[PDB]
Subunit: 136 residues, 4 copies
Amino acid sequence: KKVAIYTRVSTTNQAEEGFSIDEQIDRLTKYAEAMGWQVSDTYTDAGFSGAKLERPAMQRLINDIENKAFDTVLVYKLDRLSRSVRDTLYLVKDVFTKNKIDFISLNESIDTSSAMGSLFLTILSAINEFERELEY
Amino acid sequence: KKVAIYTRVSTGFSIDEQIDRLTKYAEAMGWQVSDTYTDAGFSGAKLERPAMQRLINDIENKAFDTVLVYKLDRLSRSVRDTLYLVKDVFTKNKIDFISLNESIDTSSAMGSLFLTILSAINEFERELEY
Amino acid sequence: KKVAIYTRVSTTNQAEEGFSIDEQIDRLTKYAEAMGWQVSDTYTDAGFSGAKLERPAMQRLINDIENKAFDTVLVYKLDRLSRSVRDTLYLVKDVFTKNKIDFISLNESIDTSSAMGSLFLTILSAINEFERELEY
Amino acid sequence: KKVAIYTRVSTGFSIDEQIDRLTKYAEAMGWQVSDTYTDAGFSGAKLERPAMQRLINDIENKAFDTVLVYKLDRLSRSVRDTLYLVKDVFTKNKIDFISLNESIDTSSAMGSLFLTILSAINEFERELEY
């Protein structure tokens, strides 16, 4: 199994980040290798907010999606992928799932290839839509 | 069931219509309405509203065991306030909550689960986005 | 709105049933009329188990589904419709929902036209499949 | 985390393979394995199994704070027993539960919700079918 790892930090001061790029890569690599997988490549956004999707490596990852280079996207923590629920639903549902690519967020133990991971997504989407309708 | 009817419009459906739909519903179910609580001309953005406050203060009295609204957004336009009201005020005091339009009844297994899921997901969303 | 009511009892001794056919019809009619609807017809299986779908009125209801005579099916209690989760998932998902017919079970306050009613169904289906895989 | 590894085969994957996958996983996560609990040649239909019992009895000792299995059905082939174990034995004693294959971790928000939903739905199903 070929797996893409996505890592992000808001700043370029690795010493001061809660989890530096290198700590993220190390955990994700160690994990993928315990699972018996291979990391096909590393997408790294060092010094970019998770508030929006307009980040070079994330854009690269989305573009490379239509190459079948990998079949899983791995993040250390969901907030590394995005800090927007709407952006996360878009990425995981309309970009990853739509192209038969699974998504794993280690810290949250969310894996969209599992029964409970896919149900989590369905629930997040349904509840998010319901909340938005209540507040709007 | 002994039900309290809560209705609101800001400054959807009119007060009269909400009262009408909910009285008809209660009677068709065989329920008794204990009182009506009407906030005519108030925002749902916050909980500071005279009839809502009268309702919350009347909990101690035990004149009703269910709060009934036509649509959830009459109760509140805030997910956080809705959860506080339904979870920490009504449920905490053994008062069931029914929203006719959303077909949500916290005395049912699925209404109760819905409330649990909404709370767990809202907290998950906060933690992602904060 | 035109609505079909489905009622069932296992035996023909109405005096001894927990909820007789007439009590079921009365509640459902009173409910539909409070809601401002009209009962287009009544499907009644008096003296049939809920363990299987092979019952005259239920079969009639399924057959009449492709007529657009009604757009909602109403039951007093889910167990009147079926006492099988698999049969219930089939009816509500593959017969009702598939033909754009909503389903309401009064006692359970389940309405498949609502956000939380449709999510309940999705969850029941996902969890039922998961349980079956665990036990088999 | 200090983890207890539970593996089982009846009379999927071998004992050796389960132990291997789970030790590698624990080490990659930085966790310590406190002990292995192996039921080689036992049905998952019931909870009466020597290593399972040793595990449950070892809870009082506090040598681990997580139970780790490769696949949920190693733990049990019964939804009712699984719920008893995970909800009323592990969670009740502040012990987390991880099933690697199902990616279920009761210390996560979504693993915890999953357990809540499975319990609520199983009860709903029983009540329909009984």
